Amino acid sequence: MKLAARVESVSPSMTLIIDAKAKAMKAEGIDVCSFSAGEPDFNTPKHIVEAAKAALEQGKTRYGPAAGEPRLREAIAQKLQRDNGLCYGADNILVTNGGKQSIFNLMLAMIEPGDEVIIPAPFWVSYPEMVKLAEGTPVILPTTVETQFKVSPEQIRQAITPKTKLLVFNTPSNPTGMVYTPDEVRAIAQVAVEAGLWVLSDEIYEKILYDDAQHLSIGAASPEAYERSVVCSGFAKTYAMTGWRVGFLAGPVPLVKAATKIQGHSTSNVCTFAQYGAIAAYENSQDCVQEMLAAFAERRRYMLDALNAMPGLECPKPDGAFYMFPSIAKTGRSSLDFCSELLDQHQVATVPGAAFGADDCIRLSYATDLDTIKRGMERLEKFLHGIL
Amino acid sequence: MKLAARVESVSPSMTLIIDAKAKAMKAEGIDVCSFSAGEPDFNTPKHIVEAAKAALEQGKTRYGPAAGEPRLREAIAQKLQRDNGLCYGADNILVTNGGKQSIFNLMLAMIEPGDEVIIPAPFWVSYPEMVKLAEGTPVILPTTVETQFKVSPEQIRQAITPKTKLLVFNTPSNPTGMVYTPDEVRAIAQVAVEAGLWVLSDEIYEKILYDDAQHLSIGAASPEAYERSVVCSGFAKTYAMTGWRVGFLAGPVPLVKAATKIQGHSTSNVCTFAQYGAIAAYENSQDCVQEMLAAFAERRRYMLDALNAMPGLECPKPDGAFYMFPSIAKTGRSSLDFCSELLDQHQVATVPGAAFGADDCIRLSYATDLDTIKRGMERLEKFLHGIL
Ligand SMILES: *Cc1c(COP(=O)(O)O)cnc(C)c1O
Ligand SMILES: *Cc1c(COP(=O)(O)O)cnc(C)c1O
Structure with missing residues (x-):
């Protein structure tokens, strides 16, 4: 009745509770700005989708x-x-x-x-x-x-x-x-x-x-x-x-x-x-890639500028992917407490760095619309001013 | 350099020589009667394919x-x-x-x-x-x-x-x-x-x-x-x-x-x-299932009788899946030898029982059209005659 040691050694997720809270808040219709996503917000390019539908029709099953x-x-x-x-x-x-x-x-x-x-x-x-x-x-x-x-x-x-x-x-x-x-x-x-x-x-x-x-x-x-x-x-x-x-x-x-x-x-x-x-x-053609990258670049610009203007943070400029991983060390709070409090107080979802082995940081993804980024960053800044 | 013991312990396939060859032979113009497939010949039912295409179109990606x-x-x-x-x-x-x-x-x-x-x-x-x-x-x-x-x-x-x-x-x-x-x-x-x-x-x-x-x-x-x-x-x-x-x-x-x-x-x-x-x-609806099953039952009946009328083979009656696993013990040959020559000499593909831990048998799959079955079974009879 005992599981293999290899699976018993796997660590439980550290974001179970905060993820559940965010989910519940949304189910209630609470206005949440989320930056926790680990995937692009774009749809798969049409020509790639079409190729798959064609293969399906051609019997590639x-x-x-x-x-x-x-x-x-x-x-x-x-x-x-x-x-x-x-x-x-x-x-x-x-x-x-x-x-x-x-x-x-x-x-x-x-x-x-x-x-x-x-x-x-x-x-x-x-x-x-x-x-x-x-x-x-x-x-x-x-x-x-x-x-x-x-x-x-x-x-x-x-x-x-x-x-x-x-x-x-x-x-x-x-x-x-x-x-x-x-x-x-x-x-x-x-x-x-x-x-x-x-x-x-x-x-x-x-x-x-x-x-x-x-x-x-x-x-x-x-x-x-x-x-x-x-x-x-x-x-x-x-x-x-x-x-x-x-x-x-x-x-x-x-x-x-x-x-x-x-x-x-x-x-x-x-x-x-x-x-x-x-x-x-x-x-x-890789046109789809450059088009998506251009939108990301635009979002990155906005979030980076906003993050850089906030007190209590330290964000090294990222040149790849679509994440920002600022240090919240100056707030004197662990990542779990910081993100849970930010969610509860200002309805902004971010991922605690503890999940990635860095308890004094948090992960944000700008793979979302610009309006969510603008409003979310405003709330975050307000949160930082209220806890320092 | 040195692979983990777990993967080094995995035996090499002794079938990809036939199941894959018959394919290569078929693609080369050779009229092969394949009974080696481990999948039905039927296309995926239309409504299922459409459901997938719809999901792709709807962005379920x-x-x-x-x-x-x-x-x-x-x-x-x-x-x-x-x-x-x-x-x-x-x-x-x-x-x-x-x-x-x-x-x-x-x-x-x-x-x-x-x-x-x-x-x-x-x-x-x-x-x-x-x-x-x-x-x-x-x-x-x-x-x-x-x-x-x-x-x-x-x-x-x-x-x-x-x-x-x-x-x-x-x-x-x-x-x-x-x-x-x-x-x-x-x-x-x-x-x-x-x-x-x-x-x-x-x-x-x-x-x-x-x-x-x-x-x-x-x-x-x-x-x-x-x-x-x-x-x-x-x-x-x-x-x-x-x-x-x-x-x-x-x-x-x-x-x-x-x-x-x-x-x-x-x-x-x-x-x-x-x-x-x-x-x-x-x-x-499960109509697609009953239809394919009907086509399977017809092929089975034919292959089963053909096999039962073949001295040199002993095949218990299979009531499930789409396989037949007759014993070739009477031939005094290993499945590797038997299947090897049957394909080379009569262009009939079957899987050596050795792959499934039974070298004295061979697996036949009737997931193919009736004409291929009757033709293949006639070639098999001739082969058997030549070695018995
Ligand atoms: C997302 C990701 C992967 C791979 O994910 P797939 O969806 O399985 O391709 C690998 N490494 C990192 C760092 C990632 O963020
Ligand atoms: C085909 C088969 C399966 C399942 O294979 P999937 O394609 O991975 O679902 C499982 N067991 C046996 C004995 C089979 O022949």
Whole structure:
């Protein structure tokens, strides 16, 4: 009657109560400004939606190879060569249910009981939980607003132990929205290569960039970095396809084949017609992406300016993704208390940094309409003035 | 360099050489009579496809609850009450990527290193591999043509040890097409109940029955069995939705919640619009099912008689699914050899029984048109004659 230890070790969500309160308030018709979303507000581009409907009509509703539709594995490989300078072939990629499964399959393929996985904080909520489902030991590397929430190569080097099996490297970042410069990624890749450790490069937000920030896949830092790294990414953020559940793992054939064995004995191939939508996302014009990015840039401008004019905060300027992760340390309140109080007092929903391993910060998403942002930021400022 | 022990323990497929070759042969102009498919030939019913297209058009493309869409979880619970006499509510349901992920999540939730899992042979190929991915130890129970390829409760009792944690029970069965009668299901249920052993009830083929055979969910055998059993099923076979990847886990709330946590940290929710199609499958008329079933019953009758009139083969009568699993023992050959030459020499595709733990048999699938069946059965007879 006892559950496996691996699942018992998974931590319960820290945002259960605040999420329920927000839900209930909305059910009552209370005017809430929400900045908790972890997905774009845009609809999936029409041509991607149409491709999927066409595949459905064409009968693309049967089983397919576990590694994914050959046409999509090819499109992905070509995209990685063209955009990221990564020399991959179709044999190097595995189609998964979102970037999440890509990461999950990598963990089960590489992490054995006892292995340590270095995870810089703040971190995407699922990272340590996934490491634990694979029976590994999460090694959290804390960062500060003073360091732009970035881990240094020396910080990584110090955390390496004979048990260290993997380094999780997410840029641009959720929840900070911070972007490691190409020189910074090259410097991090250098430490990894020297210590001979594998790197999981989570590049899901690669296209959501601002102020001419530049994205460099860590695997493109050098041929040695390429040999010990895998790309975990997908179509969710670039194309507002969060609900499609289509992503991929790209790396050395040996690893990919092992990850593919796992895919075949867990979920089998990814939804066939959903894969066709992803084919269209890469095979067609990227105009939709730039149009969406432009709206984001406009929202970012507004929220950043507002946040910068508020007392009691410290927000490092983010150049990627669609999040702001300001420090609320000056308020002397923990993230749970701060966000719960802000919601109750001013009806503004934000995510406590505690969920990402940073109790003195909060996450806001500007992936919502400008009017919600303007009104919400006004309420937030008023809240800060009332508690300092 | 070194992959986790869990994935290195997963055996390589010995079927993708045929099931995939027959395809390559078909695509090359060669007239192949394929009886190797593990999915129906029928297209997904129109109303289900339309329901999915409508969802896509309506923007059901965002993240959703890890447990699945509330409407689908409710439609599933109702279906289980109405069809299988199970009293599940929505809280007992977890929407997964096919019945395969339902089984996978269950394994990860309750199977730990050292745990033993009893698996009746011939078994669905993935069962032992999934047990091993959860680091468990499979305990395979051999059956013979004499026992109609069905295990007896005494055989199960004899195999139970203090390390036994689970019994995998699949009926109707893949690859045998055999159906355990309600009395047999009740008998097996009581051995499990007496031992306080949990039962994984793989009921995916529950609707595909013949000669008025009857399907009884193990959990409906008694309140005690209902307490320690779970249903792993889906829409794949009943509605020709194999490529949709929509299935479910149904069981006690505590277990379902644990499986849901794993779902949340592995793949997240199941493709949102694909789920809306599953809703249409259960909410609408079941005429599509009876029609396909009718076409299946006609093909079965023909293949069954053709097989029964073939000396050198012994095939118990299958009353479920769309498979036949005749013994080729008389030929004194291994299924790998037999199936290999049959394809090479007569362009007839069948799956080696060795894949399912029974090298002295072969699986035939009659999920194809009648003309292909009569032609293929004539080629099979000739082949047999040549080696007997
Ligand atoms: C959203 C996200 C992912 C992947 O999500 P999918 O919907 O599974 O593709 C991976 N990493 C980070 C940091 C994310 O925010
Ligand atoms: C087809 C099948 C399943 C379910 O597969 P999905 O497509 O993942 O739902 C489960 N068990 C058996 C024995 C099967 O043949």
